[PDB]
Design a binder for this molecule. Structure first.
Ligand SMILES: *C(=O)CC[C@H](N)C(=O)O
Lengths: 190, 359
């Protein structure tokens, strides 16, 4: 999955998240078209109670069915402040997309972090099942100790997501930030 | 909520600044393609589509023509809408298609076999958006990607690393894929030039004939044959029947800020709004980033959301999603009241919520 954001001179905004699902999808190119084919079918619940590649589970609602669109977690998002487009964001990450984007919103609104600060800040995540509070490096040992004492099952794992965001000032100035988690990414304007 | 910060000189992390237009993406080349489109007079949608086609060439890991996704569009005038171009399961797909003879899911079938694919929606979605909200013709926004495929580009660290790490597991196992991404028996390395002649032809035909080339033309034929010859399900009928769908965004209000995101078939919008509704009951600013309490509150709130996700979320054209109840502030309040800042509740004690009183 990959996400990108765009804001033009007129103030129009677009947030796009699209994917083949896993990296390179099935790895299958469709004949001589040069087009790689997605493995999005894994987003359906294959059987009630059995997790898919992201540890997500389902039942009837997300069961496989003809012509049905498998449930996604993709969240291209736009936040409005004082009636104007203010934050344009999104990110890849399968089940973690929801929490990654949530943190971008909380970091911006509650913690008053600029878009770059919010982007570079560490992330944590809990998806009910499995029952573990996943964290990236970056949190204080003192803080993790308190969380474990509260009963959280802290698990240090690999970096999560790749936010590509744009914050819009009320005066029209654009502020952007590419995730440090993705080498070779870029946010640029004119 | 406290005052916002767009960034100052004293900060550790500094945002990129621009006065006119801006593009943020996972790939430098694609980002520059988008910026160039804006400079040429295209609007946000024009640039977004151009970036989407460019990534389909420079970021084969996820950028694509053979997958699907979502687009959120907000006009300068406030009009906010969502474009659903999520893949549709083939007409021949069945509930237990991924179960083995013993009735247990086979992840190989749903991840690496020809049965793992849904009918691609990206081309349809981009055209729906470009035609209605863009200003440039498709051939114009496809041209940058076309040239990158035809003339090639230099493989960077990101692509080289992904080809080696993730590509090695699937790409060399298919002749046509290996012929494009592998070289001299190994994945393309940093510094190598990646030319994609077939993809260039596909792009050229789409630019010339429109999205119909993908869903009814030569490309559709190529996909159908790939499936028919290798136990796949996508047929010409599936491709001809695919449609991107414009849907109403899911949204909420968090401390006076309005948040807009994707509605079903995505669960993103609903759960982000639901969780924010829960958090709104706490003074998050007071706890602060990286505090055990803030993390405790959010981790707990997240549990209830994902539990609900497992039961109530699905394609809205097939199942009725109780989105009103899930994004109801009273429901969120009932959840917030269950959160003990000093003691986490095991997931085993958390089940999908009872939405009746909120419907
Ligand atoms: C990449 O983050 C895609 C995750 C999954 N296929 C979905 O949520 O759509």
């Amino acid at each position: 999955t990959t996400h990108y954001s765009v804001v033009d001179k007129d103030g129009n905004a677009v947030a796009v998240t699209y994917t083949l699902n896993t990296t390179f999808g099935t790895g299958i190119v469709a004949g001589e078209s040069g087009i790689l084919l997605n493995n999005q079918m894994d987003d359906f619940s294959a059987k009630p109670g059995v997790p898919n590649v992201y540890g997500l589970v389902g039942g009837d609602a997300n069961a496989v069915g003809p012509n049905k669109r498998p449930l996604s977690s993709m969240s291209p998002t736009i936040v409005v402040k004082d009636g104007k487009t203010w934050l344009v964001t999104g990110s890849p990450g399968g089940s973690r997309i929801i929490t990654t984007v949530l943190q971008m919103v909380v970091n911006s609104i509650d913690y008053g972090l600029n878009v770059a600060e919010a982007t570079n800040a560490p992330r944590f995540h809990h998806q009910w099942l499995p029952d573990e509070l996943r964290v990236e490096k970056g949190f204080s040992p003192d803080t993790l100790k308190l969380l474990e004492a509260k009963g959280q099952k802290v698990a240090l794992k690999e970096a999560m997501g790749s936010t590509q965001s744009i914050m819009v000032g009320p005066d029209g100035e654009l502020y952007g930030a590419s995730d440090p988690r993705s080498v070779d990414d870029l946010t640029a304007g004119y | 909520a406290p005052p916002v910060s767009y960034g100052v000189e004293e900060d550790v992390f500094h945002p990129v600044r621009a006065k006119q237009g801006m593009v943020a993406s996972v790939d430098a080349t694609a980002t520059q393609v988008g910026v160039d489109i804006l400079k040429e007079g295209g609007n946000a949608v024009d640039a977004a589509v151009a970036v989407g086609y460019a990534l389909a060439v420079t970021h084969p890991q996820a950028g694509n023509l053979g997958g699907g996704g979502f687009m959120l569009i907000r006009s300068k005038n406030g009009n906010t809408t969502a474009i659903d171009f999520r893949e549709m399961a083939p007409a021949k797909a069945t509930r237990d298609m991924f179960l083995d003879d013993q009735g247990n899911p086979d992840s190989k079938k749903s991840l690496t076999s020809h049965l793992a694919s849904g009918t691609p929606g990206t081309v349809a979605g981009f055209s729906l958006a470009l035609d209605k909200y863009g200003t440039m013709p498709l051939n114009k926004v496809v041209q940058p990607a076309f040239k990158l495929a035809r003339d090639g580009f230099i493989v960077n660290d990101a692509l080289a690393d992904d080809l080696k790490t993730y590509g090695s597991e699937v790409l060399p196992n298919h002749e046509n894929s290996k012929a494009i991404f592998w070289k001299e028996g190994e994945p393309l390395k940093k510094g190598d030039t990646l030319v994609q002649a077939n993809l260039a032809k596909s792009l050229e035909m789409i630019a010339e004939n429109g999205p119909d080339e993908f869903y009814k033309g030569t490309i559709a034929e190529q996909i159908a044959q790939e499936m028919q010859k290798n136990g796949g399900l996508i047929t010409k009928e599936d491709l001809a029947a695919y449609k991107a769908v414009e849907r109403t965004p899911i949204s909420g209000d968090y401390r006076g800020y309005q948040v807009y995101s994707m509605p079903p078939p995505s669960s993103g919008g609903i759960h982000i709004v639901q969780i924010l509704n829960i958090l709104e009951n706490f003074d998050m600013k007071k706890y602060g980033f990286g505090s055990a309490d803030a993390m405790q509150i959010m981790a707990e709130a997240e549990k209830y959301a994902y539990a609900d996700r497992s039961e109530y979320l699905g394609d809205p054209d097939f199942v009725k999603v109780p989105w009103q109840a899930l994004t109801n502030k009273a429901y969120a309040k009932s959840i917030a009241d269950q959160i003990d800042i000093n003691k986490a509740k095991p997931s085993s004690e958390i089940r999908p919520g009872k939405l009746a009183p909120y419907e």
